[PDB]
Design a binder for this molecule. Structure first.
Ligand SMILES: Nc1ncnc2c1ncn2[C@H]1C[C@H](O)[C@@H](COP(=O)(O)OP(=O)(O)O)O1
Ligand SMILES: Nc1ncnc2c1ncn2[C@H]1C[C@H](O)[C@@H](COP(=O)(O)OP(=O)(O)O)O1
Lengths: 356, 173, 356, 173
């Protein structure tokens, strides 16, 4: 069983996210209390409601990343939702309860993908046992006789019920302030179509009756023009935890580039590997890069760490096309290279608005 | 009424009178006609209705941090929200804001003018205040706060729509 | 009918809600008459209609909590509906009757969870007789062994028929004379779309045709803008009981903090136990707490007793992260501590609008 | 028309005239231009159209329910509804409301004015009233009631658009 205390949850999260420790800890407590509570009286086990977190911060910092990886970590079900959809100021429909009728699919279609290696080995030493096609098809076919009724559901739902995780996104977008984008409370309705979920209810779905009484909920939004206090009050109440994440520094970019145990630069590496080329990324390279990102962000529209991605892939454009060639060679990307493909571009700003 | 600002040395200040006028008499003559979007820096003023004037006050307030301190990068996607946009037009005010970068002026219509030397002078007695403002900010070694406070006084002194209750913010950049 | 006299219904309700004795008495009659009425003639059976209460009060007091525990105690089915949803000012659709076409599910997914025990033991002393991997399945495989036709079927609506409670929320705001929010009467349609429910009717749903001629109904709202007299007239008549709940005091939060028999603080207590730490709060610790909540309410947006929740978890953040460590220790929370982690916050008008 | 309100010692009162003048003649010269709300204090006068009022008045006594007491944190989301909003827009009314915390005003633009001494004086007799009032409120004793009523009487005497039928709500704290 996963588990692991708050201290081990921040650890694990650092293998992926840079900075934003306040968030990792805060999301590491809400989490822990589950395992905590799960072990209590029949009473409290039905009284200590989950412990939701409301994240407040600029775009491109981790809000969404923390919880996506906090899911993988928990191995539990995850699902990200744009609160905005359920506002559809068009005049359509979007039964919020749906939010659950997925974190079931994703929590079920998962089970069938979590068990294709739960009895992989086993079903094969039999996919050769009934032969002494022989593994070609007969494996799946045998993977059809692998005791699958009842157990599925019970667990599936009880996987959601257990502790699926629903990360609402850009909630701030559904509050009402005063001037500008101040249409009408119809929006504040989407706020009211959620209470059920975030307050205890049952929803009927294909696989069975799921209850969001014990689901953890992580809402976000920058809250640029609206304080979390402008959210309907019932939500303010079901949102016990509040973390304000900070704006990432150039120093953070330099980090987000190389540190995380599955880094971006480290992906390019392996990627250009399959092409016999070997890349080295100088520190000053990794730096001028960051500066690149930071620059396009200050200069034009501020997207965040997200920026790394474009500007970066825009640097191996050359490398990857050729890559097939270069096999048996080790390309070296250092500062006066990063700048041989960046400066003149990150400087036009307008182009910066199209390809950067 | 006279809002004044005089970027000088490592600082920029905005001063203002407090005379509210109903026809030919004066009500609240102690009007806090100047406040700052405490978001670190960004001092502004106001010339006209006390009512609305506030809206374009918090209006900025928010766009700032999202457009993060990048004042200029605000009036574009901010100030504009008056002319066109649907927020609210057909009003009258001049939030003369100022980061630690430059001092602008909006004639109300999402506009923006910038003093040949950043010396801002609006309000009834707006000209007078500037005539003194310029005169000192050119023949004395006086301060940004001083030349302003000294100017807002000459203004009030000669304009019957401006008094002497002052109000002024500042800083250091 | 589980029984219990008015006096006895208020007793239970006080183990959970503090104060508001008026409502507790109130919903204690509407409930009683059920027991009563069902003891008369086949005649008055279809003549004595339910006894609906309309709760008028500020936000946070206890309306919804009262009816939630009042249900739990009635062991009857319960469901909370945001009246405005069905107003769906987004031009969609939503059969009001869906309100019932749920309070059946709740009272269904229930009849099946309220029997996982009803025959747990018995069905397990069978998992023996049949034996003396797949040892924990034959438990479930008893799901059929155990009788479910008819009873755990038709007797199910008699639940969502006997005395299941439907608690409408913010009935107000669905009224017309509001000015601040005075659009039209399509809103008032929602008022007229409910009449069937609260005037007697039958709706068609999966497990069977149920009838709301005997459902008890509890609607709320603040009536800040509109009055109960501004509700369509039919409704005014099918709403015999009117009760005004009171605004909770500083003296109330101190209580809501410890008194109720599942208390907040008492939850943290048990919770932070799992981590070997023993906590304990001082009357004055618990006082400043309250004073804090009351403070945030006055100072920014007054949400109510709900504020305890955030202010509380916000002041146990430190402890709960560390908790894993501290084991075998007994952290004590007095006022010189509550202040130490809250006067700061509470003091800042704006931060309080974010994380408190 | 002259709405007055003086705060003195333990209380604050609002006085008003009853003269309603259509053209150059006085119709209902006994209009109750001053009303309370009594839900619990918060005496407010009114100056101008009697039709184009009430609305922009009782609208108050409802937020003074939710926001309960916070006259201040009332005019915010309340008063607002008068400029950049809907309901009533483009009229003529000067609702002078008084809590137990401070006497504000609204130039009829979702505005707010805090008199240099909590002394309110709006009306075709506003100045006049003020002057007498101010002159007493600082050279004699006499209470908020007295000084207010003695001043409204002086107003009515000079202003031909103001008379002497009075109406006054008082309180204590
Ligand atoms: N602090 C951080 N450390 C590492 N990667 C980060 C990061 N902040 C953002 N990223 C990366 C991971 C994401 O794929 C991408 C965008 O971040 P995100 O979490 O999806 O956005 P946000 O949470 O601001 O909505 O950038
Ligand atoms: N008087 C009281 N006694 C005990 N708990 C209370 C209380 N008032 C509120 N609470 C708690 C229980 C609820 O989970 C939470 C919110 O209360 P609620 O009943 O949902 O609010 P309301 O019905 O006013 O909309 O606060």
């Amino acid at each position: 069983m996963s588990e692991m205390t708050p201290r081990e949850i921040v650890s694990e999260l650092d293998k992926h996210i840079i900075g934003q420790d306040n968030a990792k800890r805060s999301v590491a407590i809400a989490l822990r209390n589950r395992w905590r509570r799960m072990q209590l009286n029949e009473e409290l086990r039905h009284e200590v409601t989950p412990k939701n977190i409301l994240m407040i911060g600029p775009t491109g910092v981790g809000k969404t990343e923390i919880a996506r990886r906090l899911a993988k970590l928990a191995n539990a079900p995850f699902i990200k939702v744009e609160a905005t959809k359920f506002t559809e100021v068009g005049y359509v429909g979007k039964e919020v309860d749906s939010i659950i009728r997925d974190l079931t699919d994703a929590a079920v279609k998962m089970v069938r993908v979590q068990a294709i290696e739960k009895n992989r080995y086993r079903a094969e030493e039999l996919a050769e046992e009934r032969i002494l096609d022989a593994m070609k098809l007969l494996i799946e076919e045998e993977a059809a006789k692998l005791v699958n009724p009842e157990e599925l559901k019970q667990d599936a739902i009880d996987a959601v019920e257990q502790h699926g995780i629903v990360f609402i996104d850009e909630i701030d977008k559904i509050c009402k302030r005063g001037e500008s984008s101040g249409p009408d409370v119809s929006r504040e309705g989407v706020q009211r179509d959620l209470l059920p979920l975030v307050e205890g209810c049952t929803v009927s779905t294909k696989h069975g009756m799921v209850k969001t009484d014990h689901i953890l909920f992580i809402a976000s939004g920058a809250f640029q023009i609206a304080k979390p206090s402008d959210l309907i009050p019932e939500l303010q109440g079901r949102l016990p935890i509040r973390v304000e994440l900070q704006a990432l520094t150039t120093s953070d970019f330099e980090r987000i580039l190389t540190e995380p145990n599955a880094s971006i630069t480290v992906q390019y590496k392996a990627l250009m590997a399959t092409e016999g080329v070997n890349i080295e990324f100088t520190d000053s390279g990794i730096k001028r890069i960051a500066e690149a990102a930071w620059q396009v962000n200050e200069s034009t529209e501020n997207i965040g760490a997200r920026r790394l991605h474009t500007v970066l892939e825009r640097l191996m454009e050359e490398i990857s096309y050729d890559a097939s060639d270069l096999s048996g060679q080790n390309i070296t990307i250092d500062a006066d290279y990063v700048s041989k493909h960046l400066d003149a571009l990150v400087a036009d700003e307008d182009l910066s608005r199209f390809i950067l | 009424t006279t809002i004044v600002s005089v970027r000088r040395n490592g600082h920029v200040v905005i001063a203002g009178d407090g005379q509210a006028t109903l026809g030919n008499t004066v009500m609240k003559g102690n009007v806090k006609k100047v406040r700052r979007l405490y978001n670190d820096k960004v001092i502004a003023g106001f010339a006209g209705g006390t009512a609305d004037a506030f809206t374009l006050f918090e209006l900025f307030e928010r766009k700032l941090e999202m457009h993060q301190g990048h004042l200029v990068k605000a009036a574009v996607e901010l100030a504009k929200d008056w002319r066109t946009d649907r927020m609210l037009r057909k009003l009258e005010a001049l939030l003369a804001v100022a980061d630690e970068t430059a001092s602008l002026i909006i004639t109300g219509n999402g506009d923006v003018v910038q003093p040949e030397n950043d010396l801002i002078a609006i309000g009834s007695g707006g000209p007078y205040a500037q005539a003194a403002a310029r005169a000192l900010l050119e023949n004395t070694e006086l301060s940004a706060r001083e030349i302003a406070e000294k100017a807002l006084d000459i203004a009030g002194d000669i304009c019957i729509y401006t008094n002497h209750f002052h109000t002024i913010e500042e800083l250091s950049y």
